[PDB]
Design an enzyme around this catalytic site. Structure first.
Site, short mmCIF file in Angstrom:
data_model
loop_
_atom_site.label_atom_id
_atom_site.label_comp_id
_atom_site.label_asym_id
_atom_site.label_seq_id
_atom_site.Cartn_x
_atom_site.Cartn_y
_atom_site.Cartn_z
N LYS A 235 3.77 44.23 -7.33
CA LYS A 235 4.36 42.90 -7.23
C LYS A 235 4.04 42.26 -5.89
CE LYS A 235 6.14 43.35 -11.25
NZ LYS A 235 7.39 42.56 -11.38
N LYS A 236 4.16 43.03 -4.80
CA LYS A 236 3.77 42.55 -3.48
C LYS A 236 2.37 41.98 -3.50
CE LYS A 236 6.88 42.51 -0.37
NZ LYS A 236 7.38 41.19 0.07
N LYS B 80 0.20 40.99 -5.83
CA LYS B 80 -0.11 39.81 -6.63
C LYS B 80 0.63 38.58 -6.10
CE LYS B 80 1.57 39.87 -10.75
NZ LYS B 80 2.06 40.18 -12.13
N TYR B 81 1.95 38.69 -5.91
CA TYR B 81 2.72 37.52 -5.52
C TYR B 81 2.37 37.05 -4.12
CZ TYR B 81 5.64 37.76 -9.71
OH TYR B 81 6.09 37.75 -11.01
#
Lengths: 49, 48, 48, 49, 144, 49
Positions: free
Chosen positions: D1-2, D4-5
């Site tokens: 998540k880190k 990509k976001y």
């Protein structure tokens, strides 16, 4: 030269628009100068700029 | 003729520190209220 | 079990929403957040 | 998540910053991002939250 | 014009006005606004001093008054817990608050509940190098 | 307001990028400012051009 480039960019940012993140860099440089103006003045003469 | 003279003057225009200072002063201080109203109009969302 | 993990994630989202006290019942997309931030729509289309 | 976001949001942030440099928006936009992963035992949650 | 409100020298400036100018007006104003001190004990709370343990016993409720602000401290001896509420945000005044609270707790036989955390998302009290501050500490420090 | 917006855009385009077209527009503006001379046009307060 990194400090010189940073100061140039900070002064350029301060113009056009008056933000706070760049005046923060100006204040950091002023604090550094205040710290520097408490020792021998010939230290700034010569050596690294 | 005025348009042609304007083109002739502007093609060879050289930047000047005084002129740049004047333009900066205008766009940052003189027309500040106008640009504030412009930014007001731009940054508003309207839902129907 | 998928319903169980859904409930788990629901509570783990709800209590942090309550901690922030941001009454956002339904999560929205990034473009919605930008438009709520006062960003112009035209520059959003340009960045798209 | 880190990964990509933060990739996406950093792209958006730099786009908005250089758009401010171009000179339409009055203020640059600052982005921040964090992810909290609660363990399945609910022990480290207090440390993170 | 008076004296602008700055915590470390408001009382000092009042002392100036009393001493060199000769009028004890700013001292009176400081006493009215942000200077009461003392320890106001609850009437219904009675403490018994046991000489064997050299400590007090029994429920305690103290309202520290320091001017327009008051600090309420309640000690639940059954649970051996303490609850402190106050409205002071200045530096040395609030320092005097937990100093008095710690003295009261030490006389009562327990100490402060301090936690070393790397960050608090809530509105709490934390101790730093400069002293004690209210808010959300983002730096690893001690939180009361 | 159209002129003021154009001037701001040209100035902030010439800055951050030493462009040529922005310099051309600024030259047009300076030509106009020169044209405003050669007369008096006292321009009292409230009408400052």
């Amino acid at each position: 030269m990194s400090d010189k480039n940073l100061l140039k960019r900070a002064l350029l940012g301060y113009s056009h628009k008056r933000q706070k993140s760049m005046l923060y860099i100006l204040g950091l440089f002023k604090f550094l100068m205040k710290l520097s103006d408490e020792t021998f003045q010939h230290e700034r003469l010569g050596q690294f700029s | 003729e005025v348009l042609a003279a304007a083109n002739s003057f502007a093609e060879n225009y050289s930047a000047t520190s005084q002129d740049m200072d004047l333009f900066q002063t205008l766009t940052s201080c003189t027309f500040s209220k106008e640009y504030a109203w412009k930014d007001f109009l731009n940054g508003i969302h309207c839902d129907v | 079990l998928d319903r169980l993990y859904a409930v788990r994630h629901d509570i783990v989202d709800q209590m942090i929403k309550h901690d922030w006290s941001d009454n956002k019942d339904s999560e929205e997309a990034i473009g919605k957040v930008l438009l709520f931030a006062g960003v112009p729509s035209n520059i959003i289309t340009a960045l798209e | 998540k880190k990964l990509k976001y933060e990739a996406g949001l950093t792209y958006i942030e730099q786009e908005l910053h250089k758009f401010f440099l171009k000179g339409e928006i009055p203020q640059p936009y600052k982005i921040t991002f964090n992810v909290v992963a609660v363990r399945t035992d609910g022990s480290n949650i207090t440390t993170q939250w | 014009v008076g004296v602008p409100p700055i915590d470390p020298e408001i009382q000092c400036a009042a002392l100036m006005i009393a001493d060199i100018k000769g009028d004890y007006s700013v001292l009176q104003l400081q006493a009215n606004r942000r200077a009461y001190s003392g320890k106001q004990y609850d009437a219904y709370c009675v403490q018994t001093y046991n000489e064997v343990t050299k400590l007090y016993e029994g429920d305690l409720r103290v309202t520290f008054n320091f001017g327009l602000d008051c600090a309420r401290l309640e000690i639940f001896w059954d649970k051996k817990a303490y609850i402190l509420e106050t409205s002071i945000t200045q530096k040395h005044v609030l320092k005097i608050m937990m100093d008095e609270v710690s003295k009261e707790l030490i006389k009562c036989g327990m100490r402060f509940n301090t936690e070393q955390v790397q960050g608090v998302r809530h509105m709490v009290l934390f101790k730093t190098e400069s002293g004690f501050e209210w808010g959300k500490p983002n730096i690893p420090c001690i939180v009361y």
